[PDB]
């Protein structure tokens, strides 16, 4: 719903995963030229990993299951683990180095 409508409307192919809120679903429906009511009515109830490929790169709009990547190759941001860091026992600090 934040992407510009004109830019989105010119995208060749859409990969609509599970969508929760209604505004985004309405925008996606308004930014597609091949609408099947049965397929587009299933958006808020898609499993984790399913997709609905719509556009000129496929013969028909179709509900697929994207093949999982090989084990050990999974995207992951190495953000700090709050629970693990906070569960550790506290140690005496030294803020002269920080200063």
């Amino acid at each position: 719903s934040e992407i510009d409508s004109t830019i989105l409307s010119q995208c060749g192919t859409l990969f609509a995963l599970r969508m929760n809120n209604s505004s985004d679903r309405n925008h996606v429906l308004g930014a597609v030229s091949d609408s099947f009511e049965g397929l587009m009515g299933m958006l808020p109830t898609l499993r984790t990993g399913e997709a609905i490929i719509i556009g000129e790169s496929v013969r028909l709009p179709m509900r697929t299951i994207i093949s999982p990547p090989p084990f050990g190759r999974r995207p992951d941001s190495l953000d700090p683990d709050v629970t693990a860091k906070w569960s550790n026992n506290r140690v005496q600090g030294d803020y002269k180095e920080v200063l």
């Binding site: 803020y95 002269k96 920080v98 200063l99």
Partner: protein, 99 residues
């Protein structure tokens, strides 16, 4: 910006024309920790008496300096200007540091 030089032409800091008292000592030499400013002789270099010229180096920031002095004498800004241990002496040395 307010004190007057004892010699015209040049405004050297060693030629400060402070109004001296009857006994000889200056009436108000001024203080640094105290926000009291020193008293200076009037600016009049006419004939008959000694020629005293006003400061020739001051800028046009008398009003902001007066405002800063008023803030300095305000007991509501102690947390900035008169911190407990992080007070700055005249030579720039504090009891503690930011650590």
């Amino acid at each position: 910006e307010i004190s007057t030089h004892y010699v015209q032409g040049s405004h050297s800091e060693e030629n400060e024309a402070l109004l001296l008292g009857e006994d000889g000592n200056p009436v108000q030499k001024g203080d640094s920790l105290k926000v009291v400013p020193p008293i200076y002789m009037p600016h009049t270099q006419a004939q008959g008496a000694t020629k005293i010229y006003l400061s020739n180096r001051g800028k046009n920031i008398r009003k902001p300096l007066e405002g800063l002095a008023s803030l300095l004498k305000d007991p509501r800004y102690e947390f900035l200007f008169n911190a407990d241990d992080w007070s700055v002496n005249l030579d720039g040395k504090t009891n503690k540091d930011l650590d």
